Enzyme design. Structure first.
Site, short mmCIF file in Angstrom:
data_model
loop_
_atom_site.label_atom_id
_atom_site.label_comp_id
_atom_site.label_asym_id
_atom_site.label_seq_id
_atom_site.Cartn_x
_atom_site.Cartn_y
_atom_site.Cartn_z
N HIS A 1 -14.98 6.09 2.80
CA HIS A 1 -13.69 5.42 2.82
C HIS A 1 -12.64 6.23 3.61
O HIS A 1 -11.95 5.69 4.47
CB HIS A 1 -13.20 5.16 1.40
CG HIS A 1 -11.72 5.00 1.31
ND1 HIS A 1 -10.89 6.02 0.90
CD2 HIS A 1 -10.90 3.96 1.60
CE1 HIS A 1 -9.64 5.61 0.92
NE2 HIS A 1 -9.62 4.36 1.34
N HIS B 1 -11.32 -2.20 3.41
CA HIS B 1 -11.27 -2.16 1.95
C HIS B 1 -12.04 -3.29 1.30
O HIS B 1 -12.52 -3.14 0.16
CB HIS B 1 -9.83 -2.12 1.45
CG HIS B 1 -9.36 -0.73 1.22
ND1 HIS B 1 -9.62 -0.05 0.04
CD2 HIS B 1 -8.78 0.17 2.05
CE1 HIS B 1 -9.16 1.18 0.14
NE2 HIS B 1 -8.65 1.34 1.35
N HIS C 1 0.83 -1.18 0.00
CA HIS C 1 0.00 0.00 0.00
C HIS C 1 0.87 1.25 0.00
O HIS C 1 0.64 2.20 -0.75
CB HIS C 1 -0.92 -0.01 1.21
CG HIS C 1 -2.08 0.92 1.09
ND1 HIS C 1 -2.25 2.01 1.92
CD2 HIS C 1 -3.12 0.93 0.23
CE1 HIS C 1 -3.36 2.64 1.59
NE2 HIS C 1 -3.90 2.01 0.56
N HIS D 1 -4.35 6.50 -5.89
CA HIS D 1 -5.45 7.16 -5.19
C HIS D 1 -5.88 8.43 -5.92
O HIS D 1 -5.21 8.89 -6.84
CB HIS D 1 -5.05 7.48 -3.74
CG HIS D 1 -4.72 6.27 -2.93
ND1 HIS D 1 -3.43 5.80 -2.78
CD2 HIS D 1 -5.51 5.43 -2.22
CE1 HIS D 1 -3.45 4.72 -2.02
NE2 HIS D 1 -4.70 4.47 -1.66
N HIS E 1 -7.24 -1.53 -5.44
CA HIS E 1 -7.46 -2.17 -4.14
C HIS E 1 -8.14 -3.53 -4.31
O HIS E 1 -7.89 -4.45 -3.53
CB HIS E 1 -8.27 -1.25 -3.23
CG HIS E 1 -7.53 -0.01 -2.81
ND1 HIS E 1 -7.60 1.17 -3.52
CD2 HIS E 1 -6.69 0.22 -1.78
CE1 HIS E 1 -6.84 2.08 -2.93
NE2 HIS E 1 -6.27 1.53 -1.87
N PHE F 1 -1.89 6.52 4.46
CA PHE F 1 -1.73 5.43 3.49
C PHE F 1 -0.48 4.59 3.77
O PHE F 1 -0.45 3.39 3.53
CB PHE F 1 -1.63 5.95 2.05
CG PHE F 1 -2.86 6.64 1.54
CD1 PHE F 1 -4.13 6.23 1.91
CD2 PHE F 1 -2.73 7.69 0.65
CE1 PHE F 1 -5.24 6.88 1.41
CE2 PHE F 1 -3.83 8.34 0.15
CZ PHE F 1 -5.08 7.93 0.52
N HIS G 1 -10.76 5.59 7.66
CA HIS G 1 -9.31 5.70 7.85
C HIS G 1 -8.94 6.61 9.04
O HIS G 1 -8.21 6.22 9.95
CB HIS G 1 -8.65 6.24 6.57
CG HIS G 1 -8.22 5.18 5.60
ND1 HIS G 1 -7.11 4.39 5.81
CD2 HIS G 1 -8.71 4.81 4.39
CE1 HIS G 1 -6.94 3.58 4.78
NE2 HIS G 1 -7.90 3.81 3.91
CU CU Z 1 -5.46 2.78 -0.36
CU CU Z 2 -7.98 3.32 1.87
O O Z 3 -5.96 3.11 1.27
O O Z 4 -7.28 3.92 0.06
#
Ligand code: CU
Ligand code: CU
Ligand code: O
Ligand code: O
Ligand code: W
Length: 509
Positions: A249, A283, A94, A117, A126, A270, A253
Site C-alpha cells: 500500500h 485503495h 482523506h 492510519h 478506507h 496523505f 503511494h
Molecule cells: Cu489513507
Molecule cells: Cu493510502
Molecule cells: O491513504
Molecule cells: O492510506
C-alpha cells in the site's frame, strides 16, 4: 471501552497540520474541513440495493464500465468545490482524517488528534470512505448499480497504471501530479523505496507477486499483524502498523506521487493523495486484499472482535448530502454493503504460490558470521548504517503442529524517527549466502520492510514480521538465534530502534 469516535466533523475541525513535511511549498490546500450545511448526523442504515455493485479490474473494464466511471468523475469535477460531493471535497476527507483534522473530543480527549492510519482503523476507515465515494459517483450519473474499478496490481497486466488514467486533462481520470518516469507503461514496484530498481520486467512481476504473498500470508499472519495494532481513545503518538499498510500500500503511494513536488503530491502524501483519481482505485484493491485475506481460510485469518474496534466510528457525507455515522462492525460483511469484486473464477490467485523459493544449503555458509546477541548490545541503535544482531528464539525445531498453533514473530519496537519525511528500512533474517550466489529482490531471507508515509504530529513505531516460513526457507529452524539485518533505504539518518525480540504468538481461532 474507549473506541475512537469521530466528532461532528462540521463543528469540530481544523486545518491539517500533520504529516506534511513542506507546508510552505504545499501544492494542495491544508483547509481540509468538510462543508457545514446544518445537517444532523444520522445513523447508518444498511443499503437496499437491488444488485450487488461489482468492482472491476481497471485494466479489463467494459466500454460501459470505463465510460460510466469517466462520466462520473467528470460530473464530480464539475461540482462546486463547497459541495461535499465535489472532487475537491472528497479528496479533503482523506486529508482531514489522515493529517490532523479532528480530535478525540467526543471520547473526552480534545487535545489528542485522531489518526486512522498506522492502526487497526486503517482498513475499515478506507472501506467506508470508498463506500460513500462510490455511491456518490453513481448518483451523479444516475447509475444505481455503479461500481468502481480496482487497481489489480496483484495481476501482472494490472501492474502498470491502467491506460484509462492516462492522457491529458481532457481525460477526467488524469492527474498531472504523477511521477513522469512511472506513467509510461512501467510496471509498479510494490516494494518501492524511492529509487527505481534496475531489474528485468519478468523479475519485477515475480517479486510483486511475492510482495502480495508476503503482505497477506508471510507477514499477515493474524489480525494484529494484518490489520495493525490496537488504537483507542486517549492514545497519543504507535500502534503497530499492518503488513499491507506498511508494504504494498505504501509502495504504490510513493511510486505514483510526483517526486518533483515538495511533498511528492499527489499520491506521495496523505493530504494530497485524494486529488489523484487513481488513489481511490489503489485503495479499492487494498479493500479487496481484506476480502482475499479472509478467503485464504488460513489459521489466524479472522476478523477483529474487540469491542474497542467494533464500536469505533467515522462520519461521512452521502449522496444526499446527509451526514452519516458509520461503525467498524458494520463494514465487515460485503454482502450487506451491496458491493464486491469481480474475481478470476480460477483455481487460485496468481500470487497464491509466490512464497520465496527454498534456499539451498549448498548456497549457504555454516554461520551468519561474527555477530553479537541482543543482550550483548546497547540499545537504542541508530540506523545511519546497516545494523546486524542475533536475536534469541523462544524455541528451536518446533513441530508442524506447534507451528500450526503459534507464529514465531520478529518484533522491531520503539522505532524512533522524524516523520516529516518518507522513511523506509528493509529487514533480512539469517542471510548467510556464499559469495557469488545469485540474489533477487524477493529472496527467502527478505522479511519485508518498514515503510512510512510522513505523519509527524519524532514519531514511534512498531513492526511485526512472521518467521514460521522464513526459518524453514533459510534452513535455520534448528538455530538458537536468528540473525537480523536492518538495512536503511531512505529517511533513516536520524532513525533509532529501541527494542528487538522474537515471540511465539498463539494463533487466534
Ligand atoms: Cu489513507
Ligand atoms: Cu493510502
Ligand atoms: O491513504
Ligand atoms: O492510506
Ligand atoms: W528487460
Amino acid at each position: 471501552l474507549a473506541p475512537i469516535t469521530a466528532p461532528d466533523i462540521t463543528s469540530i475541525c481544523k486545518d491539517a497540520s500533520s504529516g506534511i513535511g513542506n507546508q510552505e511549498g504545499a501544492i494542495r490546500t491544508r483547509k481540509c474541513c468538510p462543508p457545514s450545511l446544518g445537517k444532523k448526523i444520522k445513523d447508518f442504515q444498511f443499503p437496499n440495493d437491488k444488485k450487488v455493485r461489482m468492482r472491476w479490474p481497471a485494466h479489463k473494464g467494459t466500454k460501459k464500465q470505463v465510460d460510466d466511471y469517466r462520466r462520473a468523475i467528470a460530473a464530480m469535477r464539475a461540482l462546486p468545490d463547497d459541495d461535499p460531493r465535489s472532487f475537491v471535497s472528497q479528496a479533503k476527507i482523506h486529508c482531514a482524517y489522515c493529517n490532523g483534522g479532528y480530535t478525540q473530543v467526543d471520547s473526552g480527549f480534545p487535545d489528542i488528534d485522531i489518526q486512522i492510519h498506522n492502526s487497526w482503523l486503517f482498513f475499515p476507515f478506507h472501506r467506508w470512505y470508498l463506500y460513500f465515494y462510490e455511491r456518490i459517483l453513481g448518483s451523479l450519473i444516475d447509475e444505481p448499480n455503479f461500481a468502481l474499478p480496482y487497481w489489480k496490481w496483484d495481476e501482472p497486466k494490472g501492474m502498470p497504471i491502467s491506460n484509462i488514467f492516462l492522457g491529458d486533462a481532457s481525460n477526467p481520470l488524469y492527474d498531472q501530479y504523477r511521477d513522469a518516469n512511472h506513467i509510461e507503461d512501467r510496471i509498479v514496484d510494490l516494494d518501492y523505496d524511492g529509487k527505481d530498481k534496475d531489474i528485468p520486467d519478468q523479475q519485477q512481476v515475480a517479486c510483486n507477486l511475492s510482495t502480495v504473498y508476503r503482505d497477506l500470508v508471510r507477514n499477515g499472519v493474524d489480525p494484529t499483524s494484518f490489520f495493525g495494532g490496537k488504537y483507542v481513545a486517549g492514545d497519543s503518538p504507535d500502534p503497530s502498523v499492518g503488513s499491507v499498510e506498511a508494504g504494498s500500500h505504501t509502495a504504490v503511494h510513493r511510486w505514483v506521487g510526483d517526486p518533483t513536488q515538495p511533498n511528492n503530491e499527489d499520491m506521495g502524501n496523505f493530504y494530497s493523495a485524494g486529488y489523484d483519481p487513481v488513489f481511490y482505485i489503489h485503495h479499492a484493491n487494498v479493500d479487496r486484499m481484506w476480502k482475499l485475506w479472509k478467503e485464504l481460510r488460513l489459521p489466524g485469518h479472522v476478523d477483529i472482535t474487540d469491542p474497542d474496534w467494533l464500536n469505533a466510528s467515522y462520519v461521512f457525507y452521502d449522496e444526499n448530502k446527509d451526514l452519516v455515522r458509520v461503525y467498524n462492525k458494520d463494514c465487515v460483511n460485503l454482502d450487506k454493503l451491496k458491493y464486491n469484486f469481480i474475481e478470476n473464477s480460477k483455481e487460485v490467485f496468481p500470487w497464491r504460490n509466490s512464497r520465496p523459493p527454498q534456499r539451498r544449503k549448498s548456497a549457504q555458509v555454516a554461520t551468519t558470521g561474527d555477530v553479537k546477541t541482543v543482550e550483548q548490545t546497547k540499545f537504542p541503535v541508530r540506523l545511519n548504517q546497516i545494523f546486524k544482531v542475533r536475536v534469541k528464539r523462544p524455541a528451536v525445531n518446533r513441530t508442524e503442529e506447534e507451528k500450526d498453533q503459534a507464529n514465531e514473530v520478529l518484533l522491531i519496537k520503539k522505532i524512533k524517527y522524524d516523520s516529516g519525511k518518507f522513511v523506509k528500512f528493509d529487514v533480512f533474517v539469517n542471510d548467510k549466502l556464499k559469495d557469488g550466489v545469485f540474489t533477487t529482490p524477493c529472496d527467502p531471507e527478505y522479511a519485508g520492510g518498514f515503510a512510512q508515509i510522513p505523519h509527524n504530529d519524532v514519531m514511534t513505531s512498531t513492526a511485526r514480521f512472521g518467521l514460521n516460513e522464513l526459518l524453514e526457507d533459510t534452513n535455520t529452524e534448528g538455530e538458537e538465534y536468528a540473525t537480523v539485518t536492518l538495512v536503511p533505504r531512505t529517511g533513516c539518518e536520524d532513525l533509532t530502534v529501541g527494542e528487538i525480540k522474537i515471540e511465539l504468538v498463539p494463533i487466534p481461532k
